[PDB]
């Protein structure tokens, strides 16, 4: 119980896991996106990845989940988009197969959240008119 | 300015596949466009056969026609195509590929509609 | 009745497939590894369960970075060295023929000529040893590369010695590995782990034979993009390795010649003692065993009762007619006619000895209008090689006959670096995800 | 009513919109700000456009309005800086119009944002330490 | 009045083309004044 | 009709046309070239 | 070190305009620094004209001068410049340029005190 070392599962360990059990370790997944021609191509792949990086945050932030790996949101769920219950997602499917089943619904998605968190900014700007 | 092209062979047999080709240029598909084919013949005049949404695939289609068509649409090449099944006498028509849209403001008033109505192809089911 | 709502997550393990750049990770050579990163110690894997991918040999795209990569590395090399322009003279050649054998009468011509000097206003008179194949006659010759362009001598001190060479992604993306044994290069992969690269390469530069690779760990290996079509090359990897032995027993002689200012050609002086043919040397009884085992293997895909047979090379240009590779700076060219020369039906000590040849102008891959000149190496020079695959091609194949009839090939060297990389793959990652939760903002 | 298409006014365009319609639409200008003598120029051009963005980022983030794009604050409208009343102001100019009306009081009003920001910050850590 | 024929510097062929054309830069952060209260 | 200032006679004036005027002309001697090897890998085009 | 130096014609006119340029060296005038103009003449002494605010270019006159005064800045040229309107006898007189502020630290206690009171040149008025 005392003098033993530990050591935890790596960088893409979780892909196989459940959605669920691959949800708690987020932050390890997170970490890793940021960290004479040769030199040129190098600093332009620092450079793309650096604005993927960028790109990304901006993305989350315009829905109003900024500094957040969950965040919760006020759009509801279509049953069009899926038709399975959660038992059968959070603890049976893994996330490739979900995203594989769900990618022909994602841009409506995104503008949905775009225009439902405008919506809120502007209601929470009249509400502290007040 | 927006052109629409059709495009397909001019005689099919009956029981056949009738596949045509609508190309457009001057205004990308993938947008929020409902790309329209109809028909036109003698005796039934006009005849909207069915339409697709560029940017979500969905399709929707004539009910009287049933599930003898499928609509396809292709980004890279920038055209979309119909695929009408067990073709028959009736439907030789001449087949028209258009749009119809407006031109707003994001949450205001309207600015212009829009439609085309390309040139058509003659189709004729014959053995 | 849901009641569900979208849901953000950021960090989702999912990947797509990519193309990007990789960069070295290494532990004076014409492989610059000044420029390429020194490698972690304790390189780190992880083994992803549940996972099955999908794998293709013959599109991967880390074998055209790969080769480019080389081409500009040796370019890079060969910048600061002499250019030997004023070797274009007319020679006059004479034979050798002091203490030479029956097979190597003719092959060595003796051959005077002019030069320039440090001081632009004096010439002086010299004479050197050239092989047959580099003087085309015109009792006088001239070099084969002069009416193609003038071309570089390559610098003494840096080695041709290959050295391993690790490839790691950048951020943002991975690199998969199929640890799954009998995958043939393409399809579904079962057992797939994450590394941050991959094991050393050694760039080895051989056609007609892979030299120094790495060996299957189950069996013979037989690996190709369409079987069925003769027009695609067929893979063969070893699980066993056969020694060859090379040597080119001439105790040459070397020279220096001052053509300029701070200038030197270095020339073949005279051969010491006796002149004879460079040879290799391959096992009788290991090659018997390898080729059995490689035509067991290719009756799995032409038939139970077929006849396989091994015959010679149908021909062109010497590199790709001919087992060429470079032993201690010198480049040999090689007639492996008694390897593939036998009939397989369905049903002690002495070695096979390949005498071969020399050379010194190099066009070293397949480019018109630039040469690399080899200067010669001081004494007798051998080395040993281990052989672990093979590069065949079918010939004809019609349905009219019931034999099939295998040549070696080459000449392309994007398939030496093909069999390296055939087990790993690039994948970008896609942190962003929605999922659907009871949770409302 | 179906089967009609819509598409909307994009980039500067509503320019010549009043304030209160031009301050509808931010998001279509705010997504467009992020997307071998020739490579350096152009990796040069890049970078100076990551540069100009980061700067942006923090100055939003000194004043406490981090991942927002209408964040009304507590520093009071002095009326040195303009007098006239809103009636005059987002419903009969312009942005552009705006900004050369104001081009010489913007550096004050950042100092004092940047202020009463600290002082907000201060009173908060005084409040949480009961 | 007398024209003659002129040429000789190249910048000329390009200006008559890039004539109606100019490049500027977006300054997204404005202050306005309004009836809130954080 | 354009210039930076018309009244100063030390700027040009650019003309820009409502119609284009088609402009036809040639060479029409019937040349020959040759190839001279003046080096390795080095060739110089003359007028044969 | 700090230093002012003025310039502009000596000799003017009645009724017409004066106008007087302050170069400074060793700091900016883009900060938070009040630009001052003083005159001396026989029997009235010191006497201040006015001052002008660098960084928000607020200017402040002397209500005896009424409007007839005028400040201006260029960040350029690092200079400020008065101008005097309608110059009469009584406008004879030696002018300075002068500056004065504390050095302290952010919400804390004080360092230093600055002022420096440049050379001045010596301005007539007469036809
Ligand atoms: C497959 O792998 C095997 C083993 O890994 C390879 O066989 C080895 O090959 C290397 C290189 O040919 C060889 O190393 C040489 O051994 C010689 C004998 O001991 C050395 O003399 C030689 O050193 C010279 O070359 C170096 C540059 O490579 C110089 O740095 C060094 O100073 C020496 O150069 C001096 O001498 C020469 C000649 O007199 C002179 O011109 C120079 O100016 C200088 O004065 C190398 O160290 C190994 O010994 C081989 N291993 C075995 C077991 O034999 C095989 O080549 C690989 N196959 C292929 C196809 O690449
Ligand atoms: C890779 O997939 C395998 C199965 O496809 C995963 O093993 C499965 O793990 C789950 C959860 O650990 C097991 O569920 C458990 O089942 C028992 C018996 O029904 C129940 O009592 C427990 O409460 C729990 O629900 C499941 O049984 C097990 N599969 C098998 C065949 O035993 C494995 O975890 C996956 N890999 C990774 C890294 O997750
Ligand atoms: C470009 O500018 C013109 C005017 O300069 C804009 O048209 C103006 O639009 C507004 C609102 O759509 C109109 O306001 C109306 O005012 C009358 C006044 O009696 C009022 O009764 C109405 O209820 C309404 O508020 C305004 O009249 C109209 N101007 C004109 C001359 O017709 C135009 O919208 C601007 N373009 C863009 C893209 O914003
Ligand atoms: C190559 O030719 C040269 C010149 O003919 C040979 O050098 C001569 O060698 C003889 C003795 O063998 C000497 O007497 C001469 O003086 C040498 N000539 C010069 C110019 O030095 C050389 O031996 C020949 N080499 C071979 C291998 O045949
Ligand atoms: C090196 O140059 C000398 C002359 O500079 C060559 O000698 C001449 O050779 C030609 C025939 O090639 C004769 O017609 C001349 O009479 C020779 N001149 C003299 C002064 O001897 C010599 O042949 C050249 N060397 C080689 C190997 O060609
Ligand atoms: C030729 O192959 C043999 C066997 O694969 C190599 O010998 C092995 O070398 C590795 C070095 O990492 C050792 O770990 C093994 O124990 C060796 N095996 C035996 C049986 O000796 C040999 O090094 C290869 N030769 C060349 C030049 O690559
Ligand atoms: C592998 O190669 C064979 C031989 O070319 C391919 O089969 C041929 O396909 C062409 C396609 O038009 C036909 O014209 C030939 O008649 C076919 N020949 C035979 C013998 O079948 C085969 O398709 C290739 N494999 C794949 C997967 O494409
Ligand atoms: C290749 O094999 C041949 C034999 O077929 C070797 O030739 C012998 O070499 C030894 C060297 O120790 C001599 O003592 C013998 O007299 C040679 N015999 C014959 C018949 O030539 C040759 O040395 C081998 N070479 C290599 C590099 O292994
Ligand atoms: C290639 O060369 C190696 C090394 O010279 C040979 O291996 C040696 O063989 C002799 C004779 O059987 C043994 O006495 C040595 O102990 C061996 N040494 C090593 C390191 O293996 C090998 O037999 C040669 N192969 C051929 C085909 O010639
Ligand atoms: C493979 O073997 C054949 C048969 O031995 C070779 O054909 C010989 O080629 C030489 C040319 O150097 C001729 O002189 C012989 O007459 C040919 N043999 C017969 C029986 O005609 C063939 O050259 C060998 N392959 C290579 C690449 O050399
Ligand atoms: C490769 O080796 C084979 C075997 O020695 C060569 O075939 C011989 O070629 C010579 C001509 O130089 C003929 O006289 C022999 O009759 C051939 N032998 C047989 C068994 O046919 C072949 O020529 C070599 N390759 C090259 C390019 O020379
Ligand atoms: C256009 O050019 C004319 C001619 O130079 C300018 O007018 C001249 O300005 C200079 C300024 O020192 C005077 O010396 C000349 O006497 C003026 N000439 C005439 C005829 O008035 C004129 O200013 C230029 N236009 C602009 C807008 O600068
Ligand atoms: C330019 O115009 C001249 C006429 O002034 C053309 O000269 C004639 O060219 C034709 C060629 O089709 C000949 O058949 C006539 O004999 C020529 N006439 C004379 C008087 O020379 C000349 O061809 C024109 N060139 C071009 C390029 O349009
Ligand atoms: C040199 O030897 C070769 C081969 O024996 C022969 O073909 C050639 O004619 C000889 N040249 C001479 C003796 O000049
Ligand atoms: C150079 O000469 C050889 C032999 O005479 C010939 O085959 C080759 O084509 C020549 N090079 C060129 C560029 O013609
Ligand atoms: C071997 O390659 C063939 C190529 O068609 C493929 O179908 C097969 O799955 C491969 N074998 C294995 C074990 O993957
Ligand atoms: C080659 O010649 C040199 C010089 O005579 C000698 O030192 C060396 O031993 C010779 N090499 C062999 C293998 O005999
Ligand atoms: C090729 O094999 C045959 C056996 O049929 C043999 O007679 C011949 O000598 C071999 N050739 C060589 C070059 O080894
Ligand atoms: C130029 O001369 C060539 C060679 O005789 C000839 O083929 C060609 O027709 C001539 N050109 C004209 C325009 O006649």
């Known amino acids: 119980a005392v003098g033993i070392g530990a050591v935890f599962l790596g960088f893409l360990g979780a892909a196989g896991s459940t959605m669920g059990a691959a949800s708690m370790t987020l932050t390890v997944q997170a970490r890793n996106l940021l960290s004479t021609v040769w030199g040129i191509k190098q600093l332009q792949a620092r450079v793309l990845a650096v604005e993927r990086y960028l790109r990304d945050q901006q993305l989350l932030g315009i829905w109003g989940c900024s500094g957040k790996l969950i965040c919760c949101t006020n759009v509801p769920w279509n049953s069009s988009w899926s038709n399975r219950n959660l038992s059968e997602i959070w603890d049976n499917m893994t996330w490739l197969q979900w995203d594989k089943e769900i990618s022909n619904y994602t841009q409506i998605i995104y503008g949905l959240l775009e225009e439902s968190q405008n919506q809120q900014e502007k209601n929470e700007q009249d509400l502290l008119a007040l | 300015q927006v052109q629409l092209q059709e495009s397909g062979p001019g005689l099919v047999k009956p029981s056949e596949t009738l596949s045509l080709t609508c190309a457009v240029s001057?205004?990308?598909?993938?947008?929020?466009?409902?790309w329209n084919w109809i028909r036109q013949s003698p005796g039934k005049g006009l005849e909207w056969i069915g339409n697709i949404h560029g940017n979500t695939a969905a399709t929707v289609y004539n009910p009287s026609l049933g599930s003898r068509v499928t609509f396809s649409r292709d980004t890279s090449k920038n055209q979309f195509s119909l695929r009408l099944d067990s073709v028959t006498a009736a439907d030789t028509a001449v087949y028209f590929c258009?749009?119809?849209?407006?031109?707003?403001?994001?949450?205001?008033?309207?600015?212009?509609?829009?439609?085309?109505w390309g040139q058509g192809l003659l189709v004729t089911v014959s053995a | 009745a849901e009641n569900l709502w979208v849901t953000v997550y950021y960090g989702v393990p999912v990947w797509k497939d990519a193309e990007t750049t990789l960069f070295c990770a290494s532990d004076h050579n014409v492989w610059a590894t000044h420029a390429c990163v020194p490698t972690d110690p304790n390189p780190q894997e992880i083994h992803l369960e549940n996972v099955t991918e999908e794998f293709n040999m013959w599109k991967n795209n880390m074998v055209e970075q790969m080769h480019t990569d080389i081409i500009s590395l040796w370019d890079q090399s060969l910048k600061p060295c002499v250019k030997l322009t004023p070797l274009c003279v007319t020679l006059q050649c004479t034979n050798v023929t002091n203490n030479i054998t029956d097979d190597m009468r003719g092959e060595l011509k003796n051959c005077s000529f002019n030069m320039t000097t440090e001081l632009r206003d004096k010439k002086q008179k010299v004479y050197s040893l050239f092989y047959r194949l580099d003087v085309v006659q015109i009792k006088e010759y001239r070099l084969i590369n002069c009416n193609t362009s003038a071309c570089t001598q390559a610098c003494p001190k840096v080695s041709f010695e290959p050295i391993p060479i690790h490839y790691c992604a950048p951020a943002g993306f991975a690199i998969l590995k199929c640890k799954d044994k009998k995958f043939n290069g393409t399809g579904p992969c079962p057992s797939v782990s994450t590394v941050q690269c991959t094991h050393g390469i050694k760039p080895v530069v051989s056609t007609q034979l892979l030299l120094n690779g790495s060996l299957a760990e189950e069996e013979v290996m037989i690996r190709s993009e369409n079987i069925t079509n003769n027009a695609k090359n067929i893979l063969v990897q070893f699980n066993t390795p056969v020694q060859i032995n090379c040597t080119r027993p001439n105790n040459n002689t070397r020279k220096s010649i001052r053509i300029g200012p701070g200038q030197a050609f270095y020339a073949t002086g005279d051969i010491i003692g006796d002149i004879r043919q460079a040879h290799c040397n391959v096992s009788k009884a290991t090659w018997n065993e390898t080729l059995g085992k490689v035509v067991k293997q290719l009756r799995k895909h032409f038939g139970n009762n077929t006849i396989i047979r091994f015959a010679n090379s149908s021909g062109g240009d010497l590199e790709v007619t001919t087992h060429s590779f470079n032993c201690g700076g010198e480049f040999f060219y090689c007639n492996t006619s008694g390897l593939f020369n036998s009939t397989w039906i369905s049903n002690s000590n002495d070695s096979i000895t390949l005498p071969c040849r020399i050379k010194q102008i190099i066009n070293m891959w397949q480019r018109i209008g630039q040469c690399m000149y080899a200067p010669p190496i001081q004494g007798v020079i051998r080395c040993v090689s281990n052989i672990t695959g093979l590069i065949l091609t079918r010939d004809g194949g019609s349905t009219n006959s019931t034999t099939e009839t295998f040549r070696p090939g080459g000449g392309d060297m994007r398939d030496n670096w093909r069999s390296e990389l055939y087990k790993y793959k690039v994948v970008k990652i896609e942190p962003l995800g929605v999922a659907p939760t009871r949770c409302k903002r | 009513a179906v089967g009609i298409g819509a598409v909307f006014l994009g980039f500067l365009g509503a320019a010549g919109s009043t304030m209160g319609a031009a301050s509808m639409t931010l998001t279509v200008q705010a997504r467009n700000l992020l997307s071998t003598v020739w490579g350096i120029k152009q990796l040069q051009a890049r970078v100076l456009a990551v540069e100009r963005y980061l700067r942006d980022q923090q100055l939003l983030g000194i004043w406490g309005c981090s991942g927002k794009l209408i964040c009304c604050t507590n520093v009071p409208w002095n009326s040195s800086w303009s007098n006239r009343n809103l009636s005059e102001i987002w419903d009969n100019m312009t942005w552009l119009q705006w900004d050369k009306e104001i081009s010489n009081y913007t550096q004050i009003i950042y100092g004092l944002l940047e202020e009463s920001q600290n002082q907000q910050e201060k009173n908060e850590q005084d409040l949480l330490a009961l | 009045e007398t024209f003659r024929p002129g040429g000789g510097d190249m910048r000329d062929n390009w200006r008559s083309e890039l004539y109606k054309y100019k490049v500027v830069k977006i300054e997204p952060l404005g202050v306005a004044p309004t009836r809130c209260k954080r | 009709i354009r210039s930076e200032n018309i009244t100063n006679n030390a700027k040009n004036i650019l003309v820009q046309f409502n119609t284009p005027v088609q402009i036809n002309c040639t060479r029409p001697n019937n040349n020959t070239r040759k190839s001279i090897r003046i080096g390795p890998g080095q060739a110089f085009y003359a007028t044969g | 070190q700090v230093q002012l130096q003025e310039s502009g014609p000596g000799l003017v006119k009645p009724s017409e305009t004066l106008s007087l340029t302050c170069?400074?060296?060793?700091?900016?005038?883009?900060?938070?620094?009040?630009?001052?103009?003083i005159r001396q003449s026989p029997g009235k002494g010191l006497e201040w004209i006015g001052n002008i605010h660098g960084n928000t270019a607020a200017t402040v006159y002397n209500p005896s001068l009424g409007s007839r005064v005028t400040f201006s800045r260029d960040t350029s040229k690092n200079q400020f410049s008065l101008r005097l309107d309608s110059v009469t006898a009584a406008d004879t007189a030696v002018?300075?340029?002068?500056?004065?502020?504390?050095?302290?630290?952010?919400?804390?206690?004080?360092?230093?005190?600055?002022?420096?009171?440049?050379?001045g040149l010596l301005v007539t008025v007469s036809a």
């Open positions: 001057g205004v990308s598909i993938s947008g929020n466009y409902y």
């Open positions: 258009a749009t119809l849209y407006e031109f707003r403001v994001y949450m205001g008033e309207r600015i212009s509609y829009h439609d085309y």
